[PDB]
Amino acid sequence: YQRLRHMVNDKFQVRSTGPVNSLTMQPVKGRKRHGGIRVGEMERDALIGHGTSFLLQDRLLNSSDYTQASVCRECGSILTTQQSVPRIGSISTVCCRRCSMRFEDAKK
Amino acid sequence: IFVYQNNITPSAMKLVPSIPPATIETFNEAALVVNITHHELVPKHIRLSSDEKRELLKRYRLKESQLPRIQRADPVALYLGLKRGEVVKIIRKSETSGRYASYRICM
Amino acid sequence: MDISKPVGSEITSVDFGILTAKIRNLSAKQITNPTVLDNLGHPVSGGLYDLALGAFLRNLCSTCGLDEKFCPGHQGHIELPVPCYNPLFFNQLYIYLRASCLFCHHFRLKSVEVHRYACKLRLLQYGLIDESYKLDEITLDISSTLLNELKSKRSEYVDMAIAKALSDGRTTERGSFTATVNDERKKLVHEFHKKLLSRGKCDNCGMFSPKFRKDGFTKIFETALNEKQITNNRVKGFISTYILSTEVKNILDTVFRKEQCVLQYVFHSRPNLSRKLVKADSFFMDVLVVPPTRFRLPSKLGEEVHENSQNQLLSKVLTTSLLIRDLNDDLSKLRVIFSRLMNAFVTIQNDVNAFIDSTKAQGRTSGKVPIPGVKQALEKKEGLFRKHMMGKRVNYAARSVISPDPNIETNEIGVPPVFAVKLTYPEPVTAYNIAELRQAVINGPDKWPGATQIQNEDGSLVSLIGMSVEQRKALANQLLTPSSNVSTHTLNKKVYRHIKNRDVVLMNRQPTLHKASMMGHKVRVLPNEKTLRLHYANTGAYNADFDGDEMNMHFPQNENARAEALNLANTDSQYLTPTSGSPVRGLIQDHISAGVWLTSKDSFFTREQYQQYIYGCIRPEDGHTTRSKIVTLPPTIFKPYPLWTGKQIITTVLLNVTPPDMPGINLISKNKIKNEYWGKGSLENEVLFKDGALLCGILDKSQYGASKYGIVHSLHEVYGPEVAAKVLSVLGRLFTNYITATAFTCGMDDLRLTAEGNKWRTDILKTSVDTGREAAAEVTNLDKDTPADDPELLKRLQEILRDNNKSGILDAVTSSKVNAITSQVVSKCVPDGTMKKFPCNSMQAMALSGAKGSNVNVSQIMCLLGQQALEGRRVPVMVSGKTLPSFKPYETDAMAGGYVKGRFYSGIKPQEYYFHCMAGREGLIDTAVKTSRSGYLQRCLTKQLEGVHVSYDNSIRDADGTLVQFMYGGDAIDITKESHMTQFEFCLDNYYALLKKYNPSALIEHLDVESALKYSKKTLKYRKKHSKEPHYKQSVKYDPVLAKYNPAKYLGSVSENFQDKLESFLDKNSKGVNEKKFRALMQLKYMRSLINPGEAVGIIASQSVGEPSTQMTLNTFNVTLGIPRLREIVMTASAAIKTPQMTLPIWNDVSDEQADTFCKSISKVLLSEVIDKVIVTETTGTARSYVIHMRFFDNNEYSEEYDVSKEELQNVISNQFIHLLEAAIVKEIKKQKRVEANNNMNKVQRDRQSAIISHHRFITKYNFDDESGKWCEFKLELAADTEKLLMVNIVEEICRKSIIRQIPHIDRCVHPEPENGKRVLVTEGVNFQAMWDQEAFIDVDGITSNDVAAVLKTYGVEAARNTIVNEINNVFSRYAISVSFRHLDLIADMMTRQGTYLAFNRQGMETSTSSFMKMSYETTCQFLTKAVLDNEREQLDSPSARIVVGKLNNVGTGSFDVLAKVPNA
User: Fold this and answer.
1) Contact A12 C1448 (CB under 8 A)
2) C-alpha angle with apex C390: C388 to C392, nearest 5 degrees?
């Protein structure tokens, strides 16, 4: 008998949660750095084929890059919103930039 | 119906819709040799009057443009004289299920 | 995602559009400094890392005031001083620039012709196509009072056409855009841009404008105008410089002000309810925007930080915007200042060109262009839209190597304790789980049945890692204490427990070719293991072999996704495949080969052995029994020594796992093992189950393997999917403990023949010493056994070798004669001439049972290998005639050609060891070219059919609402339900067990019963009154009952093919069950076997063509085959098929003799094919002469083979041939300035020659054999000025071009063998117009091609649809693969949905609604440009659109809504 040199000591990975990628807020690639498992194009279509829309929702939105963003209803935008910098007696709140006319526009 | 022999003059084919009420439908008598609706692969086509076009689109709640399409210059749409908007009923001999009605609109 | 944080608002639709230059209201950052950093690392004010663009390097952002982990980032803008054009929209500004008049400033097309397309594209933005063609109905130096009267009347029709459809329920206020509405609109705008672009001069001014010409996407050149055009300009309206882009703007800002009636509908596909204006600034970029700092953080590599790529082409923009800012002040304080300025516009255009695209800009042109830019960040296989939207990386997942286990269940996975202490589930703590979740906190992260974190009601976590027992025991008692906080009083805590035995898990493999490669296994946590661990029943579904394969394991994190891996994607419901309904799950090798030993008739068991095998497989503690007590049987031998039989253990394991209310299983089936292997008059091939008791026959692969209509497939139908998964688990444990107690082994004596059977094959292989010469002496057309070294045979064999066709004839005669000797040995020696026989021979028992291997393998071990066939031929042979240096050249031997009379038991000789290595390698180079053949075929199927799904009215519809079919296959039956539906004998044997399965008692008070049974008996009687009528003469009174009645509501509305089968069962048989109460069972079995609404039958149909095509990849064993054929039908939808054919059914009176005469009157004849020789005697003197003499064949040879009379050779040689020959002698002269003899002709032959001398250039003489047709003759003379010509090699090429008689587009007609009585003629080439005049020979009503674009062209779109489903089925049936017709009907109804033949490609995708399906497929930033110019609202309903916006998919569990009936008002 013989014993083949390649071994299963360095093959696999587990991940519950960990580091991300900063552009996408998605789990990083890498066996050492606690990287994620890829659910690609073909694995997506197996989840549409079973008809399970919540296993597709979990394996693409919830377990990858779920965020609760802030969206203006008036202009329909994500990247134009901003939490306001308040008066010291005030609670800050979410405000839209391009739906806002600046205060030296008191039109009489 | 105007059955020509080899062609029509291209100046004269501009006058095919020149009567707006009455349609002119021109055929080449080399292309009229075999009736194509006798072929094994051409299913039975039935044009539907507007009291069963409308009951089709009520049963399935369709727009007219959501049905499958048959072209205006289809060999069977030129055969039956299907105007745009007419819904034809195709009785297909399906392999798994035998006779099976399908519909298809002319646009 | 946290379930304690709901979200009230969600996105319905997405409007595309253009950011105007009023980013000033958005952006107040103003990024102008091209320097980015300084010393000591602070980001410079105004630079590209400005702190008003988000927090950076532990600072706070200047705009929002938050840190690096709370700031969104903000968008700053680079002020461009000059309007550089937008490089996406350059191809569409160069359309409206080339079509404008610079003098009229309207267009170069008439004001009413432009008005007509402003009037047809308005009727198309509402959903009405009929009225946009009836606008051309409205017609009648014309004065403008009529052209304003035609304008005022067409606009009156549209006001009537809209307000009629808008007053009805046809269209809405926001239009009725659909796919065909998009198709007609993509044709007019493609035609409006074709009548704008080709006109020369202005129809409204008469004067006209010069012609623009561009370069490779940088410059506009206003070309100079010649004086002929100026002379028209000076008389009409008077009663190549680079153009600065502010002057291209002022043209198009003058064009668009006048043309606001027409461009308001070209740029808007739905109505423009915001009533905006198509402005010219949309095509030029006045400013930029700069993405926020978080999206531009420094891109390090290795262990050093480097600057971001997207700043390197955004600083090169910003230095050049600083160069031009100074030089405008240099001009204004008062040459070279313009050449310094115009050259700067060359690069500020090119740098913002290089910022967005990268393939647009040339630049350095040294190779390896840096900074790919914002298009190349989106377009690739990777891009952004397929690597980070359509596929992602997930949390809470693992992967590991898998390993076998027969002691876990079939629906389970073995999870190691490495993964078990990591993967966690947020279990909300309540009043019922608090006893289990206290112990999980007390166990903590160390022990397995434990936790790792608790989530408080404020959302803050508490890790349990660094704590000890007393901290964790304290906290564990605080899980139900309410918070003081009242804003979060609704909530409870969430313990992140470890993964227990009641969790589920999605497994996976790397090619996920179908949906049974991803299934819902339950969890069993196994100690002392480091690999994931899987049962053998799953090894065929994942296509998994246990050789170091890894499987990805996904652990879903809420109760919605758990309830779907338990109920929908679980392994129990994936028993039958959706391709053709075959079972995929069953036992494998040592379980197959133990059932032949356990259920054998020799197997007797004592009482102590009997109860050990029952409890060793069935344990009431783990929940295998149904009666809470193990019940046994009385033994089958009482008195001398009480004994049970091995078939009686199978009765006991089915008596304990099947429920006690239902009766037993009744099955009459077969095995794989013949009745002669067991002895004399045995009946052990017949499997008999009576009242759940195996009474006869052993069990094989055919019963409890992955095989249909056995016992596990029959318990699945009677008892359900849950019982059939317990039976595989019980038998997997029964035959494992039987193999442990009673083993199976394969030896060296299992491979041996007896001394008589070894003598048999020595005699039969001795009769092959002549066989290689007998087939050699045949092909050479010698006879009567010439000797092998005969010098006249060796001459003939050498001729065979030099030709590739004749060598395959030698290989096909000899490989059909030595394979006769091969199967004579196997028929004599393998079952009967052995030493150890089948109830002890393991090599035969492993192949008869189907455990491992076949009888081909057993025969090569035991008897001989045989012919080693290579590339569908025999062994390849050297130039010298030799096949090895050991053999004689042209050795007529079987062994010399590669026949192995050796076997693997005694070894093979060195010559035939070398030929067997040749056949071993051609099976490995095919695997070298088969690693992914069908990857892009399945991908392109799965995206067009991506949202096709069964609707609640049982109509198969696309995601955007457009109907594809009216039922699924015309009967609406699921493939995974139809298996025992036409098995009427099995259901009658099991009437009383299927009666309480398909329970009609608490069923029939909800569903109408006697309305569709009444109508079907009307039609069934009536459909027998019109049986002999042809299909065009058929009736239209009665459309089928499925069209009138919903099959899921009306009992008895059944397909007309199942109705004919059940009547043909209930009449040809007569068997205490009536026929009346048996109709009510199967008509209810039809009603419970229907497809469910929300089934993704579009993805399934694509997976049922893609996944069995990876099997369909083999090479040569005429017509296009396999994937290169299926990449022509399904993909690319070619009108140029490589091998188009036509199949011609012949009549009854025309015999095969008269059909062969008919094939000779269609197949083309070249004049090459009737010539024996051409003698060209060239002479010189006098004029170079050329005497062309043609030897034809005998007149009774070419007028038998080719049906060409010698009166047809004359009319081709005189009329056609000489004009072609004299065309090429002249054409060479252009390049040149750069036997027997007969005479004494009569008057007929003389004046025929006289017509040819006067009708050709250089001929002067001619003759023809008008007696026998054996020769022709003509004697060209050329000038003496001409040099030497190769006249023969012109005659050889013109004779191979001159047709004698070709029916067009058809090369050849052949008479093949009649399969299924079909006497057909196959015709290489398609012309239906030609074959219609052959009606005395050919049944013209039944001719059928494979060229779908031709059948579409001649016989309509429904015949083309039939041609698709029969040409995809011919691809799969040729490899013995079965797919359902429900999958093939759904593909032909998606291709022929526009009345055309649309491919699955980019171009057939253009007639579709969802823009994100187009962006995510390929060419992302061309469909994006088309979606923004169209101002197209994405309705977000394709499943590729919802994943982009992060929405619940609209198929299956998302095809409805759940609402909660709350009690109080």
Assistant:
1) no
2) 45
Q: Look up the CATH number of domain C423-499.
A: 3.30.1490.180
User: Would you say C36 and C255 are in contact if contact means Cβ atoms under 8 Å apart?
Assistant: no
What homologous superfamily does CATH list for C575-745?
RNA polymerase Rpb1, domain 3 (1.10.274.100)
- Superfamily of structural domain C746-909: RNA polymerase Rpb1 funnel domain (1.10.132.30)
**Residues in contact with C68: Cβ distance below 8 Å, sequence separation at least 6, in sequence order:** C55, C56, C57, C58
Interface of A with C in 15-44 (CB under 8 A): 15-18, 22-24, 26-29, 35-44
CB contact under 8 A, A37 and C513: no
**Record: contact B96-C1381, CB cut-off 8 A:** yes
| b/e sequence C160-183, b meaning 16+ C-beta within 10 Å | ebbeebbeeebbeeebbbbbbbbb
Distance from CA of C126 to the nearest CA of A (A): 25
Which residues of chain C from 559 to 588 reach within 8 Å of chain A, CB to CB?
560-561, 564-565, 568-569
Cβ atoms of C869 and C774 within 8 Å: the answer is no
Residues 942-1001 of C with CB under 8 A from B: 953, 955, 961-967, 969-971, 973
Q: Are C54 and C294 in contact (CB under 8 A)?
A: yes
Distance (Å, whole) CA C669 – CA C667: 6
We find that the CATH architecture of domain C396-422+500-574 is Beta Barrel (2.40)
Q: Are C718 and C994 in contact (CB under 8 A)?
A: yes
How far, in Å, CA of C651 to CA of C657, rounded? 10
Of B72, A24, B58, nearest in space to C387 by CA: A24
Rounded Cα distance between C159 and C1318, Å, is 60
Stretch 1343-1372 of chain C: residues touching chain B, C-beta under 8 Å: 1343-1344, 1351, 1354-1359, 1362-1363, 1365
CATH code of the domain occupying C972-1092:
1.10.357.120
CA-nearest residue of chain C to B23?
C137
Question: Which tokens is C38 given?
Answer: 């300084």
User: Is residue C104 part of an annotated ligand binding site?
Assistant: yes
Taking CB atoms and an 8 Å cutoff, what residues of chain C touch A49? 514-515, 1096, 1099-1100, 1103
Q: Rounded to 5 degrees, what are φ and ψ at C525?
A: -90, 115
Would you say C529 and C414 are in contact if contact means Cβ atoms under 8 Å apart? yes
Q: Who among C1039, C1354, C1393 is closest to B68 (CB)?
A: C1393
Q: Which of C410, C297, C403 is nearest to C43 (CA)?
A: C297
Touching chains C and B? (3+ Cβ pairs < 8 A)? yes
Q: What's the rounded Cα separation, in Å, for the pair C134 and C122? A: 13
- Pairing between β-strand C532-534 and β-strand C397-404 as defined by DSSP bridges: parallel
Residue A95, class by beta-carbon neighbours within 10 Å (0-12 exposed, 13-18 middle, 19+ buried)? middle
The experimental resolution of this structure, in angstroms, equals 3.1
Q: How far apart are CA C1357 and CA C1155, in angstroms?
A: 31
Residue in C1057, C1351, C1357 closest to B98 by CB: C1057
Nearest-by-Cβ selection for C395 from A17, A79, A85: A17
* Chain A residue at shortest CA distance from C52: A82
Q: Which residues pair with C866 in a beta bridge?
A: C900
Cα three-residue angle C1008-C1011-C1017, rounded to 5 degrees: 140
Do residues C541 and C516 lie in contact, with contact meaning Cβ atoms separated by under 8 Å? yes
Q: Please tell me whether residue C429 adopts helix, strand or coil conformation.
A: coil
Q: Report CB contact under 8 Å: B70, C1357.
A: yes
Nearest CA distance, B4 vs chain C (angstrom): 17
**Spatial distance between the Cα atoms of C475 and C464, rounded to a whole number of angstroms:** 10
Buried/exposed C752-782: b ≥16 CB within 10 Å, e otherwise: bbeeebbebbeebbeebebbbbebbbebbee
